[PDB]
Paper text:
The [name]-[name] tetramer is formed by the dimerization of two [name]-[name] heterodimers through a back-to-back packing between [name] subunits, resulting in a linear arrangement of [name]-[name]-[name]-[name]. The assembly of the [name]-[name] tetramer and [name]-[name] subcomplexes in the presence of Ca2+ is mediated by the interactions between [name] and [name]. Each [name] subunit interacts with two [name] subunits that are proximal to the central axis of the uniplex dimer by forming putative salt-bridge networks. Firstly, the α1 helix of [name] is oriented parallel to the membrane surface with its N-terminus pointing toward the C-terminal end of the transmembrane helix of [name]. This configuration would lead to the convergence of the KKKKR poly-basic region that extends from the [name] α1 helix to the C-terminal poly-aspartate tail on [name]. The second point of contact is mediated by the α11 helix of [name] and the poly-aspartate tail of the other [name] subunit. The [name] α11 helix contains multiple basic residues whose side chains point directly toward the [name] loop and likely form the second network of salt bridges with the poly-aspartate tail of [name]. The binding of the [name]-[name] tetramer does not block the channel pore of [name], nor does it introduce any visible conformational change to each [name]-[name] subcomplex, whose structure is virtually identical to that determined previously without bound [name] and [name]. Thus, the uniplex structure obtained in the presence of Ca2+ represents the unblocked state in which the channel pore is poised for Ca2+ uptake.
Numbering used by the authors:
A (entry chain T): 85 to 118, 122 to 208, 230 to 399
B (entry chain S): 108 to 135, 145 to 158, 193 to 252, 276 to 443
Write the structure that this text describes.
Amino acid sequence: LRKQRFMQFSSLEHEGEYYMTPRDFLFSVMFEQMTSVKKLTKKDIEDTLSGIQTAGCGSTFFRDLGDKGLISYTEYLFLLTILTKPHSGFHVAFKMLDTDGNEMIEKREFFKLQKIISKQDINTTLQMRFFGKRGQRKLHYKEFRRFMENLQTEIQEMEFLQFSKGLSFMRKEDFAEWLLFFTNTENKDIYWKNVREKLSAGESISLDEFKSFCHFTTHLEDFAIAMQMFSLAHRPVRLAEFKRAVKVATGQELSNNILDTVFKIFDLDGDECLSHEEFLGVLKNRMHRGL
Amino acid sequence: DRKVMEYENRIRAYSTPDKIFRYFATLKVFMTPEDFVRSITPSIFYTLGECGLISFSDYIFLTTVLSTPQRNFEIAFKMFDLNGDGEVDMEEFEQVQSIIRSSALTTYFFGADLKGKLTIKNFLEFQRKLQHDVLKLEFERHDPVDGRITERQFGGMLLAYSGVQSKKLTAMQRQLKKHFKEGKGLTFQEVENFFTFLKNINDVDTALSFYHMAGASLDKVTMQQVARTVAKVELSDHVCDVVFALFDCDGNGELSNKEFVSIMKQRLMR
């Protein structure tokens, strides 16, 4: 039923085929529900997606485009899978998209994705980004990896500026309210009791802290190993071992205020221990996209 | 005596592992190296010695050895190593093991004179030898026809690995012999590649979810490409034919997530 969200945030179309803006893509990432679909013929397509090299290929690429972009439903699901993918599966997905074995993804790979779309039953933005105007340009692994990390990082930045409310910093209330976004309302309100009572001022929460935290939340199942080890061993996880587990998982240290605030959040009982069960359950509810 | 045979399955599949431990442990609390096989089934025994499974945590540890993909395994080696020198002696594992529970294999695999100098490769060999011996024992319980188990035997092995009491798939299992009136057999290498593939489904789940949130129609060439990609294993078409004949419940030709992959992933979770 992921077609129905594409039905929701469509705003332009062509020959019965709904499209989106990059902005509608970003709203499908974040916003629940809001527009008017307008029609486009071929001259409109050229005037919109002309000049893709004008956009900078850094970490602001859809903000470099704004509305200048039309996204097929195949590209829509493709970018959603990029947003859901952990770091480890990069070269694996690249070689699965390397059917011809030529260390490359080609335009026939996207046409085979459209073959999948057809079995489930027009020049777009990423076609120009990775293959030029007609597909004559090629696509290697390094551009692919940089594109995936830039996309995820720009999503991190846009959520950061949403919940930080335009500042370069965050408070702990903003971090908790973002972190408890896809939680059920009763546990949310018990957590809000924990916010009102057990959370304090602390200090401002920076950008790289949130970036490392989002990098943590894309590696939850590999983090769950020592969790189930000391779960079936029934060792309630303290903060010092949690530091070691996070460092082994991500490869990067979180700051102590992150760990302190997380420990103030997920300790319902205040018993200096970890209820890892509800932690991991509502966390897997929380890091599921498409919603 | 089926009433004990079926009764052991629920406890060995769902109960806490100390209830699984004391039900199969006789020395007192200790198991033998051969009580462990009865605990895991409804030569490396000579290497295990007698000092084994003191506080049912060598059970947990070798269970983890049986249930860990390779990128989950190297990071387990990371979380063993305290100082991060790339070696784990028996002393660091003793320090971890006291935290776990809060030595005849430590004398075997780490060092003889309390001298543990352990690379990543030996730790990999440990898992490979142990899991390959367990897989060989499971291959030889069903008495292969000159190294070729039958179709219902391999389907029973898959259902024993899945751990879900599906009466539908149980009905399909005894139909497998009736669908394929001829069966050439399933060799040990066909088993050895395919359970290697089944070990890594949560890594395979990356491209499978890529496929899946678009469509749920799994064909054989995609599975063989991801098998040869991730696990670097080869799946013969007889194996995927058996899998399609066993698990395609609606019979639409190609598998969805909740037919096969979601259930196998849920087994990998618990």
